[model samples]
Target: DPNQYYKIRSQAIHQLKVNGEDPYPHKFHVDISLTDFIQKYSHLQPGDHLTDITLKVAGRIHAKRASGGKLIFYDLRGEGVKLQVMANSRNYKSEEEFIHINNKLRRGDIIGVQGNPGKTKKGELSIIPYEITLLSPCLHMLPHLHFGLKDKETRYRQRYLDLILNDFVRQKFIIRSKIITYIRSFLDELGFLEIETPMMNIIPGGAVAKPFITYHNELDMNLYMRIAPELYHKMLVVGGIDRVYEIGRQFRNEGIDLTHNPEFTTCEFYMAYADYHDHMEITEKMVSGMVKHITGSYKVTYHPDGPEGQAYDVDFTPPFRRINMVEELEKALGMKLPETNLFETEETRKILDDICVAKAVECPPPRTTARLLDKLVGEFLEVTCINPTFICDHPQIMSPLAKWHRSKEGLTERFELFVMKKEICNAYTELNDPMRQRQLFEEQAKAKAAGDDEAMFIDENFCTALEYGLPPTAGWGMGIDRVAMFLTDSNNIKEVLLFPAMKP
Candidate 1:
């Protein structure tokens, strides 16, 4: 081969084939990770780096070079740093050994080389291979090597590969885990118990999201993939887990968007003896604590609505901005979306249409003023509303799960933690009044009867639980993936998720 690179690769493959060993081995064992190794020795310099501290460097051979059976050098990376290794006739004492190195260590083949760590003259730190083992063979040449990735659709399909090839993508997932940890801990501090709610239910109730349905042949009943875990968690509240929360996955089997995944993560909690003001105070504490855990303080650049190019200075140090939800529309779009007319109405639709128009959007829906206002808030003010804002007093028309706002007209005491214009968390005072709860569920039942699949169904069991005189309480729900997105700075949804659902 004229190309020296391809020639060496060919030799590596040939060497393995000639030997009895299979390049794709079944299993290999190693204790450490790339991250563990890097962090343990980050203080070491390029020249001072030593291999006396033996380490196992297992990864793919990213680059290789061979000079007509002379010394060979290649780069390997699995955890992070690309470590260099060498090969020669003497490097292998036997004929069987020589062929494996010459043939098996192809690009995309996962291998482990343990040796003394040292730096080359070029100041590159890598593993000097004394012995190598082929763990997995290359099925195909690596794709999206230069452009960082290949097809956008394919990237989602091969999300694992994208994570392997993208550092920022991996960090997003790491950040996601941290976000959950913080969420769980934050709730725990205030006496909220971490609990698991039901995933399979006879009725999909609590929120207005569609359910993916299935049938239980043995039970002779239809089952629904829960659109939300709201009802069950409330059941817990009734059963006396006073302050309870769940970070679980919810499924819809619906359309896809930047924000809408068929299956997504939600952190929902219900607290006893609390109100909307309580929701406001604690939700702030939880988010501010989370931001501090991730960024080491309450100050972070959030786009409140969406990924706004602009960054708003938000300080989570107590006493965040508190704005009435209806006023939010006015502040952003410069029009009063009066509390009297946010429900099913032509005027409400016109209000949303105006919001979209202001942002140069082509259209807006007429029926869902709540959803429309949410979008308008995201588009017009999201990017610029960088500071933490307690957007409360949401119109009663849009708030079925919340109690009426104490001071606001025609609104509920619902506050969504917004930083960077994106909702990080949502909480409101729980409606403990049995009569009011029944009325809300009855309205949902009416909607369900009318074939509004996205409508919440009346979970009679939950209603029965509510009948057991409940105390004043507050509740909140936040998404795990969305939290990870901002923390990891990932723009694409699939990049942060492991095995995100893809079309076959």
Candidate 2:
């Protein structure tokens, strides 16, 4: 039915003749976007004089109030907005013209206004419209005009309409964009070369998570939306592209939750010639700076544990506590870890069972290590952390891509950045030693053969690239969606993301 209405909008000889107006006409122009008008003009001094200033802006009709007799007051905004616009009978040629404009448009109508800029009788600076051109007539009435969008399912499903209707929501995205820009520039200043990694590849390696698979009919091959970009960024490091970073999507097959999305933006870069310790410092500094750039301080009141808990304002205020992952696990369980390693042989599952871990199954839990640890931390320490920390020196079992400790410690040089008790950045002293990499690959291969379908398969090309002897490297992947979720005080990943992937 809506499609049929759209057809009539484009071409309707009878409707135009009955209304005495042309549905299809030319000569429409928009010189400035809503964001540019607000950002570029929000900072004028009170006494600032105007010299025949004129600015043409076009956007949706956020609200419209009719004063009858060819006069209306409305607010126009896009991803952002300026507070004012006014139209009068003198602007339009006749009553028919005004009626055509008003009847054809309503709340959420897309239009462009052109005229000299000036304040109305109410002291609001705006383009006194001599022209109003409908760019797009909104299909139907928005469900809730005054309240905007509040329903979770509908908000994500129709984000474009949500943006059109909500001004505060636009603020979050505006802030999100600024954070991304600052992040890119910060990496650029650090001499990192931004590289675009392939979205479609033979194997996905980086994080321990399932991926979305697609079929390429042409090649009769299955392709996967990347789960993470870590492996590729590192391959570049191995290729002597010393410093590389990428900000893109890494889709995973996972549940929608307060902090995880099936498809989300992940930012990762490999800094060759550094180790995990270096990454810990880098992460701390980067987050602290990003916070300051946005809120002008390291202190911010972000909801750590969602609506269920009191607001835990996070401050990246440093000397961030770093605890060995095993030690931290030991703290939560309140018992010694299963003590056998070299002489006495026990399967990891048996050890976990012996420890009587709450959710651990007979072998590995029915979840990936990251997912399991995430849940564990959520239940125990993370909910009460109320502080910033770096949970580092993760079990080597949990990190497939990170290098093992130099002293042959079983733990990998991996540190995850946590703020308000939520996991944000995962950083590693990247594994570059060719022998070690091959060994890890073989281990993963054996796991796969043993029916551990979730285990990462060998990526020969990446291993072959590493055979060239990569420099000591530190790589980091921060879930940008989760970061935006936290910084924007959003509960679900969907709240921050324009569109979060959903299960069929």
Candidate 3:
């Protein structure tokens, strides 16, 4: 079937060239957009005429019909505007000329025209063209009028076609762009310097994620696609920039799923002289306020698995519930963890065993204390964390970069904001003490030696920068792709990402 369609369209293309018409051209000038023309001329009455004024417009023809070979009508769809183009034989040089033009045009071909704006006898605002020029021709057959596009693969692959036919898909990307702009505006108004960090790094030392490795052939060295801009942003903070942030792309050498993508966007901001508590207060206001600003409400739906077929709603009202990391695990398991410490691997194992440990599925192999705790949270805590909630005070093993808690013995001042059972934001008071920072990095280095690829390598340069005195800082990172998914009611990360990766 595709071959047959190709053959027919190939001949059509040849015919256009034979008729001395360029099937595809580099440029065409238009006086006004169809939308603007309608906005200015829609008030014309049925009998009103504007024969003296010539207006130029360009758009793709979505519909075509002819009346007894003397008159032709085409529905031209432009940028968010639709107008009927009526051509009669009397207006052309000759009836044969009008017929010849009518035979040359078809649906999906982009054309430009000089026309007079007028109203038809039936009161429909229309354009009567004096001249028509083919700008670009569509070779393939388009979808039928009544039969809609329904294939998932087609919708994503042929995104241009989808946008032309589906209004909701078109608007989703529009809203995504606005959401990014609104975030920039929200940060800029607060005097935060929007900065950019390198996308390739000698050391990927920001967060605990696998790096996409690359080779710099000329330099004869290895490079890594940055998994996070955390380390670089902190260096700026040490360089005396009080408030700095970056909204950019981050790549992870990871698998793909409904929520996971190899490449994504994240926004990271660090504030000097602030702590996790300050970060939390603003995090609540920023996200909840953004939802209200975007959709005119703090309430939205986030299908847990995918957006195509789910109806789960998530409320993002401010003042989200907060819970201590260890306490919530203790409460959910109905047993207290070891009193002295919870990071002790054997003690954590005992806690997991005593609590009817069903051994969380899909956990990282050779589950260490941190991974085990993560499994516990995933099974018991996150399952029920549908509404926006903050799980705070993570253990030191799970958060090597966060500052130690002021009073809690084994916990750090870190909180991960979870909504719809997905981690939305990770924020904490930064560890500024060089000695403790080195100790944590050493521990992580040992873990890496023990076959934990996700463990961060010792970034000695960052530690040296810290020794130069990084003010007590608060840092926050959020996944912009995930936020777009939730705010737009799209559960798949690919929905928000334009040109998401796909296999050939």
Candidate 4:
């Protein structure tokens, strides 16, 4: 059926050539967007035709109907606004020409119309066109306007069609753009310089995520897609660019889930003379302001279960709730945890493993002290974070890149912001001691040897950079896609992403 429709449209294209009319024109000028046009003329009453004022508008034909052959009506849409276009024969030079032009028109055709703004007899705002130019002809039939393109697979694969038929899908991406723009402006106003970092790195030294490996043919060495921009941003801080941020894509060779994507966008920043507490304060200000700016309210309705599921309001008010990670976990377990240096010895790790066994908690393989603590926190602490909450002061073993808490003996000055029980941001006081950093990296290397694939590699150059007397700094990183999801009320990461990954 599609092939038949294509052939018919092709014949129509040839017929236009035979009649010496271009089916597709190179240019068609538009004086106003459909939305703006509507807003400007909304005061007009029914049958008030402003024939003296000519306006040019362009959009795709969403619907078409012929009223008794001499008069035609079309729903023209652009920028998510629709306007009725009434083509009466009397407005044309001749009936034959009017009928000819109307016969060639079809739904899904991008057209430019020169018209006078008016209202129909039924009080609908309409465009009475004196001229209509076909900007682009659609050869294939589009899905029905009412039925729409609803198949998730098709929508993800042919996103152009999804965008064409779904207004909400288009709006989601628009809001995403706004979110990124707001973040850039917010940081720029705070004296933070936006900087570009390399996507391909010799060693992925930032986060503890598995790197996507690629071989550089000419260089004859393996390269990795960056998992995070943390290391480079800190290096820039060491190089005297005190405050810097990057909003860019990070690649992780990880599993895909409702929240996980192999390739994703993140905003990472570093500031000198700051600590985790400072980062938290700035985060609260930025996030609350951003939420208000995007939705005009600090509260957004989120469907944790999915669109068809129950809705809950996620409040983004400033001064989010905070809970110390170790304290909360201990309360949940009803037992006092051993000294904070759980990773200091194998004996300490086994002690925690014994606790997991007693609680019947499943700790997946590698069963490192950090992994055990992470699992317990996810089970007991993270679930309680229905609104914006920060899980703070994580164990040192869990945060290798974070500076040690000045007061807490074995705890790091770190916090992860969670909304609806999912991590939205991670921030910490960065480790500046070169010797301590080397020790942590060495431990990570040992973990890697013991079969933990998602372990940080020791970048000697970064250690060398730290040796250059790096100042005390705070760093923050957030998944931009996740932020977009939260602001848009989209439960899946793919909903916010314009072109999510798909199988062939």
Candidate 5:
């Protein structure tokens, strides 16, 4: 049936050539968008015609109907708005000419029209066109409006078709653009310089994630797609670029899920002479302002399960709730944890392992101390974060890049912002001491040697750069894709991503 449809459309293309008409013209000039034209003439009363002015408008035909073989009606769509087109035989040279043009037009065809603004007797804003030009022809039948493009796989795979048929799909990406633009302006206003960093690295040492590998044939060496821009931003701070940020893509060889994507976007920034507390204040201001700017409110209704599932409103007000990770986990377990050297001793790790077993929490193997703590946090503290909450002061074993807390002996000054129980942002006072950085990197390398795939490697260059003094910098990294998902009310990471990865 599709083959027959294709053959019929092919015949139409041939027929246009036979009639000496171009099926696809080079260009057609338009005076305004279909939506703008509708807005400019929307005040006209029913049957009121503006025959004095002729305007050219262009759009794809969304629908077409013929009435009594003498009049034709079309729904023209552009810029997520619709305008009705009314074509009468009296407007053309002859009846035959009118019917011929009407016959050639079809839904999904891009057309340009020279018309006078008017309104139909039905009170529909209309365009009375004296001339019509087909700019492009649709070769296949579009999905019916009543049924719409409903298949999730098809909609994501053929996003072009989805955008054409669904206005909301187009609007979602428009808001995504606005999110990025607002962040750029917000940072720029605060004297932060947006900088570009290397996408490919020889040593992927920024974050604890598996790097995507690539072979550089010319260099005859393997390269890695960067997992995060954290180290580079800090290096710039050491080089006296006081404030720098980058909004870019990061790659990780990981499993996909409702919230996880192998490739995703993040905004990372580093500011000299600042600490984790300072970064937290800036984050509160920026995120709350951005939410209000995008949706005209500080609250968005989100469906955590799915669209058909239960909905809840997430508030983005300033001064979000803060909870200490260790304190919360301790309260949940109803037991006291070791005060210091949590990871330096096997005894401390065994205590955590026993706690996990007692609580029936599944800590996946290698089950190291960091993994044990992370599992406990996921089981107890993370689930309690229904609104925007900051789980702060993680154990040093868990945060290899964060600076040691000023007073907490075994804790790092770090905070991860969670909205709807999902980790959206991570920030900390950067570990600037070269000696301490090397020690943490050695610990990470030891973990890597112990078969932990998601462990940081020792990058000698980064440690050497830290020796130059990073000036007590505060570093912040936020998952932009997840933020977009939260703001756009997308339940899955794939919905926010323009082209999510799919299996062949």
Candidate 6:
């Protein structure tokens, strides 16, 4: 055939087929990663600038080329490092044997090379192979590099291939690991113990969200994948484990959107004697510190969505802008809301309904006062919060788990940190008054019955824990997926997730 590349590729497969060997092998033990191999020999020996030092290396062939039917070269990538490997005809027993063997090693093959470290005349570091072993074979050609698998659904469904083919995708996940690691150290430095919490519960009581329900076969009772670890973490606080945190999966049976997934990760921490104000301070410090460590500065570049598809510099420097939630909402809507007795449901609903009508807003299902107010904030307030801004002092109804404002009549000490107009962090001066907490939960019960699926459940056991006395605690939660998105300049939450939910 005139197409030499395709013919050579098929001939390579034919050689493997005749050998009756498994294209994919079980294992190969390597002493070092490709990165280590390069780093160890980065500075060559003085005499030849190349010594006959053989070492074991294993990596996937990212590219390959046959040199004049006499020698072959392969570009291998392993552990985020790239290296060049050359198999010379002189090294093989016979020229014919080298040709046969070289023909079978194609791009996308996982290979083990025993080679001496050396440098090319062009000053490129490379491995001169004493021998090569086929570790795994790619039955089909990998997707072309320049024109990648661009379809969103295809990328999501075949995430393994996506990561393998795209450097940026793999790099982002590496950054994700580094960020999580830094978070652990950062929290540990602040005297917080990383702890594990239950993933299943008889009653899911955390943030307001629908739960992924399942039946416990032996117990013959229903359990739910935890929506958040909030309740259990706080219970540990009640049990005298002060300053606890968890970085774990949170399952929310909710709609998938740009910023959401049914299964995601959250980092929630509770400080025994801190308040929302303290939470805010720690948040700015922790998050900005994390960003600085991950990207080397407090100022970061992210492609937050808007009219322009461009990378915008986001400033997460300490002391992020703070605004009163009530005042911000009023300013956005250009109207005054009732300052006192705002939770008088009927009266509050009437006022919100009138504002929704005047503003020509499409109220989400059930059109409840809380939903209306949330819609207003999302439309007007959230969109304008491009910088790292703290929208604090939320309405009492929306922040059921928060303490009443120290001075405001009907507001709670709550702050949601927004970056690039997306909510990344939420904090609360926890409500410790058992009576008021029960009242809020009961109110949530009414909302749940009235078709509000995102309402928190009344965990009587949790109320009892509160009654036993929770310290004046400050709590915070930041969605790991959302944080990764901002840190990596990704537009969709799924981009940050290793394997996001996809349709069957």
lDDT of 3 by residue, 408-434 (tens): 988899999988877889999999999
Error of 6 at 283 (Å): 1.2
RMSD of each: 4.7, 4.4, 2.2, 1.7, 1.5, 3.1
Q: What does the lDDT read for residue 301 in candidate 3?
A: 65
Please, what is the whole-model Cα lDDT of each candidate in the order they appear? 0.69, 0.71, 0.84, 0.90, 0.89, 0.84
Tens digits of lDDT, candidate 6, 216-318: 8899999999988888988989999899999999998889989989998889999999998888888888888899888988898777553276767888888
* Candidate number of the best TM-score: 5
Q: Rank the candidates by lDDT, best first.
A: 4, 5, 3, 6, 2, 1
Q: Best candidate, lDDT-wise?
A: 4
Q: Which stretches of candidate 6 lie over 4 Å from their true place?
A: 1-27, 42-51, 306-308
Superposition error at 269 for model 2 (Å): 1.5
Model 2, 234-329: lDDT tens digits are: 778767799899889778887777777777787898887888888778887888888888877788887545667777666677678777666677
**Regions of candidate 1 where Cα sits further than 4 Å from its true position:** 1-19, 26-56, 94-96, 144-146, 301-317, 328-384, 407-409, 448-452, 502-504
* Tens digits of per-residue lDDT for model 1, 459-498: 6777778888667777788877776765555545565677
Error of 2 at 176 (Å): 2.0
lDDT of 4: 0.90
Judge candidate 3 at residue 276 and give its lDDT. Answer: 96
RMSD of 5: 1.5
Q: Candidate 5 on 1-504: residue-level lDDT in tens?
A: 767877898899889988889988887888988767877889999998887989999989999987767788999988888999999888655777777788888889998888899999999999998888889988788888789998999988999898899888888888888989999999999999999999999999788888899999998999999999888899999899999999999999999898999999999988889999998899999999999999999998988778888999889888999999988888988999887655568998899999999899997789898999899999999988878899999889889999999998899999999988889899999999999999999999999999899999999999999888889889998998888889888878888888999877
lDDT of 4 by residue, 1-504 (tens): 888999999998888878889887777778988989999999999899997899999999988988786789999987888999998888865787788778888889999888899999999999998888888899999887578888889899889999888889999999999999999999999999999999999999788889999999998999999999898899999999999999999999988887899999989989999999999999999999999999999999988888789999888888899999999888998988787855577887887899888878888789988898788888889988989999999888888999999998899999999988789999999999999999999999999999899999988999999999889999999988988988888778899988898767
Lowest lDDT 10-residue stretch of candidate 4: 337-346
